[PDB]
Amino acid sequence: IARTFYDGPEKNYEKTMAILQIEAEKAELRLKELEVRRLMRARGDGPWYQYPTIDKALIDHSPKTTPDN
Amino acid sequence: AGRIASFLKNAWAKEPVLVASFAIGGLAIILPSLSPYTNYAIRINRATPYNYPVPLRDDGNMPDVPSHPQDPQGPSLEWLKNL
């Protein structure tokens, strides 16, 4: 029965280790992502949460019929 | 091209005002694109000095910018005087 239908314990052992490593990495990544999101929303210095500002290319840098603009 | 003549005849017999209005409007749309004076009108509008011309700081590299209004450089409005 063991030869025909089942395998050794080493296979399940090492598969369990691989699964545990994947899940632990995923958990640490989720926590890190939450912290990064909080920091980016608080500060705004990162790529995320970059709300638009007025484009400076719309400014007209020409004499304005009045020296004091 | 043959039935349109009869249609125009009927319209002129019955609705001269509509025919006149449509002819005048069509002329109004199509004529300005075929006129050589619209460019002259644009240039006349562009040549009206509403604003003070601010002088440029001399750097020695403007052969085409006048130093005085009576200098030969700069745009000329002699086309407007003869227009």
Ligand SMILES: CCCCCCCCCCCCCCCCC[C@@H](O)O[C@H](CO[C@H](O)CCCCCCCCCCCCCCC)COP(=O)(O)OCC[N+](C)(C)C
């Ligand atoms: C000498 C023996 C004396 C005593 C007899 C004891 C009787 C025991 C037989 C009863 C078997 C119970 C069913 C349990 C089947 C386990 C299914 C599965 O777990 O096994 C698969 C193995 O496949 C097997 O071939 C399963 C075949 C059994 C199919 C059962 C069907 C029986 C129904 C018969 C009904 C009658 C039909 C006629 C209708 C009129 C696993 O696939 P695989 O990942 O690759 O193999 C991994 C292990 N390896 C790598 C070491 C090989």
Ligand SMILES: CCCCCCCC/C=C\CCCCCCCC(=O)O[C@H](COC(=O)CCCCCCC/C=C/CCCCCCCC)COP(=O)(O)OCCN
């Ligand atoms: C491309 C130019 C377009 C812009 C110019 C137009 C300027 C403004 C004119 C349009 C104003 C509104 C249009 C009016 C539409 C009226 C249509 C209608 O249903 O009226 C008909 C009357 O008119 C008609 O029969 C239908 C159209 C008749 C001819 C209208 C013009 C057709 C084209 C004429 C000009 C063709 C191109 C120019 C060449 C001129 C020839 C040298 C019914 O008459 P009732 O008053 O209701 O009846 C009361 C009496 N029982």
